[PDB]
Symmetry: C3
Subunit: 114 residues, 3 copies
């Protein structure tokens, strides 16, 4: 899994350890080892949600499997909770795109997975 957050929240408002927490919590939620988890946070973005420039976030979770109806609800509760608690972004100003990747379409270490 790979999780990306883009947000208009400033860099100074991202708390120390945020990437570590995302890594740890995503490992728990996906059942994948922490070593596999990639996390990417992009603050200070020029963005709007519903025509308002109040704090918001646009995110993606790519995973080889572990994506589906109930699972995605659970990820959204977890991730919106974190963005609310840590970045002070209201859950209703977050979008998260979920992508179930075929292993053959993920490159790593000079090759691809299967």
């Amino acid at each position: 899994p790979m999780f990306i957050v883009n947000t208009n929240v400033p860099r100074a408002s991202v708390p120390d350890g945020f990437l570590s927490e995302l890594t740890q919590q995503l490992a728990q939620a996906t059942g994948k080892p922490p070593q596999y988890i990639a996390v990417h946070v992009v603050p200070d973005q020029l963005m709007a949600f519903g025509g308002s420039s109040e704090p918001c976030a646009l995110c993606s979770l790519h995973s080889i499997g572990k994506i589906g109806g109930a699972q995605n609800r659970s990820y959204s509760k977890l991730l919106c909770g974190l963005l609310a608690e840590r970045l002070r972004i209201s859950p209703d100003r977050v979008y998260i795109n979920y992508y179930d990747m075929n292993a053959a379409n993920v490159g790593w270490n000079n090759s691809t997975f299967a």
Copy 2:
């Protein structure tokens, strides 16, 4: 719907009103209330298009429905028009990825739209 623009145009060349203009125009084009629309503009990017560093844009439009052959051809006119006028980008230096999202794969407000 969610619209993202990555461009090598500098930040000071992005008009202050561009996010709101995109929001309004996309609401009309998709038939969704403006409140649903998220927009994200990423200037000052290191990019090349056809081996040239002249102004260009790499974009995406994600939507739960309202994506298809004819609709996409129409969106491209709308979006190239906006980018040409407001960012001075030639329309043949714009790519737009269109993604039709399943509601189950869009997280929002601690859940998903499924």
Copy 3:
């Protein structure tokens, strides 16, 4: 095709000529004329891979066809090779997402490629 690299490597470590090298190498690898190729490099990112902030990269390759099992392996060797040689990023700290795009979902110059 469009290739995007997001990396925590600093801007100054990205060699002059990198975008041109990517354009040329992707033209060769995909068989598509260089005029069609878009490349985008995003340094100085806040990211972690396996909980570690050592150099890493999260990448994507979108293409209308020329995507598949064996081809993706070849692209990964090529692109990890370039990231290792030019940006000093170890291949096992790189993910690359491959997307086979429908021509109807690629917008360019007021239309799509369908």
